[model samples]
Target chain A: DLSSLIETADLRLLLTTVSTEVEAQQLAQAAVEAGLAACVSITPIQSCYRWQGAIARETEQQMSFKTTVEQLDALQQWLQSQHPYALPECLVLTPIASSVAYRDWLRSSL
Target chain B: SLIETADLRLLLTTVSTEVEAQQLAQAAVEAGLAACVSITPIQSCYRWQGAIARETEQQMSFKTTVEQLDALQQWLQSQHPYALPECLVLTPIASSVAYRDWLRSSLS
Candidate 1:
């Protein structure tokens, strides 16, 4: 691991909700307060699963957040601690290079 | 399934990705937030920023009582994969007698 951080030209924050609005705000608020993210967007989702060898389906709240790679680790840890499930998926997708204005806003906002 | 009371059916909408959908379903059922849930694929069309857009969407429905509606909605709003994930509570107005009876029984 290198001590010097890579200087990414841009970053954006994506946020999603789980199954509830309350939990959604909690996650977004936590991330922003910790300076780990710039924004969180909430989206609703329906899901299916294989449980005990049987397929099951249920509705869920989904949230996506935008942030840089360095901030991802802290954001992930925060999500894990606030999560209801034993293992919550904290997905972090790299910000597209073309989103320059949005990235600038994110950096300034954070 | 025997029914002693009436309750609304809820569908939580999400994106098409396989992993997040699976996680939400597992957590909700294990917690008994729903009697049953079914997943379906749909192409959703809607207006965003005054333009028509379409995306592959997944819908997850939960069989639950009205008493549980608030909690269900709250859970989704707070923990959803997206902001404003469709949290619709719909009434099955035309269910067959046998099916209604089965639904009622399933919840209890």
Candidate 2:
């Protein structure tokens, strides 16, 4: 059965881009330690975007933060202050359905 | 501004081979089930059959809508070689105005 635990729990997944794996690890660890996120998953991504009115291609790390809607504001505030980029890319996603066990673990962690 | 498009969703799956990943992406996009598909290579580790397993896998992210999720999932199941294919859906809460518009227009 597909259960929407995050939906009912007001949970959300926040995304952001960082330059290196070390930075990603640092931010992820800090977010968890600060009680702003339940867990963070980092993935290596090739980012191509416009910068300085020119197309730029670079390697970046993507971090997915699992947290609740109540903590969204604080989390974003903290991320904006800590992110290296002048204009950081912060995105949010709503979970549709996830494993019940995972959701329970996430809730408790948060 | 937050995305008001409730149908927008992102689907994730993984394949053991690049060819398989490409095939799935092409099929999903051509069928109008997804606007775009991004494939990336990464190492995946998991426990299976009471043992630890590790392998390099290609992860495919599909930008699609909720209306197409079922059909796309069925297509994946039919085409994927893995006995138990990974199919996860996430709803987009926010995005750039241009990007969101392009995504909606790219699909039927």
Candidate 3:
């Protein structure tokens, strides 16, 4: 009656980074207000990654957007269009479990 | 969920606000529950009750040993505000050798 039980739950986490806190907070607030993201949290990081041939580093704000599976596409589309980066990092993470209250709050909020 | 043998696992937890991410991260290492813990902001999406819901949270990864799990688990329970905190252990084998031992020594 069910598929493999080894997988995570249906929820997804979208991660993207921005250069400044001003833009990061602005987008986070806007996404939640638009109901595209139920919540968005921001953290500071010195992102270092290899580009074309050399490595690059910068003080970036890593933003996490919370949205349900059904809402992922909408959030993705909106993020790409409004995001300042030509190629913003939108990594998705899923979870196996969540607290009862948090789950309910997310469902109601989104 | 100790899904493997001899695996130095990573205990993952998500906190929905409260103490700053760094505070909890440092505490875990100081408590010997973890060798090192990393803090980051994570986006977690979910689908439930016929609807899609979303929320952002602070993510922490506690690099620890299997022997330390039970203690770490209980300690987190005491600190978390929620009846259920989002905590999970890695069931897979993933690592780097030199840093692994360095991390292993940091714990008990």
Candidate 3 lDDT tens digits, A6-103: 23376677889999988887888778777777667677889999989899998998887777888899999998999999998988877544444455
Measured with C-alpha atoms, the lDDT of residue A27 in candidate 1 is 65
TM-score of the second chain for every model:
0.71, 0.88, 0.77
Candidate whose TM-score is highest: 3
Give each model a TM-score.
0.44, 0.56, 0.63
Model 1 fnat? 0.00
User: Any runs in candidate 3 off by more than 4 Å, and if so which?
Assistant: A1-8, A49-54, B1-35, B39-59, B64-74, B80-93, B96-108
lDDT agreement with native, every candidate: 0.54, 0.73, 0.70
DockQ of model 2 vs. true complex: 0.16
- Chain B TM-score of model 2, please? 0.88
| True-vs-predicted CA distance for residue B77, candidate 2, Å | 0.7
Interface RMSD of each: 17.8, 6.4, 8.4
The candidates' DockQ values read 0.02, 0.16, 0.17
Task: By TM-score, rank the candidates, best first.
Answer: 3, 2, 1
Judging by TM-score, tell me the better candidate of 2 and 3.
Answer: 3
Over all chains combined, what TM-score does candidate 3 have? 0.63
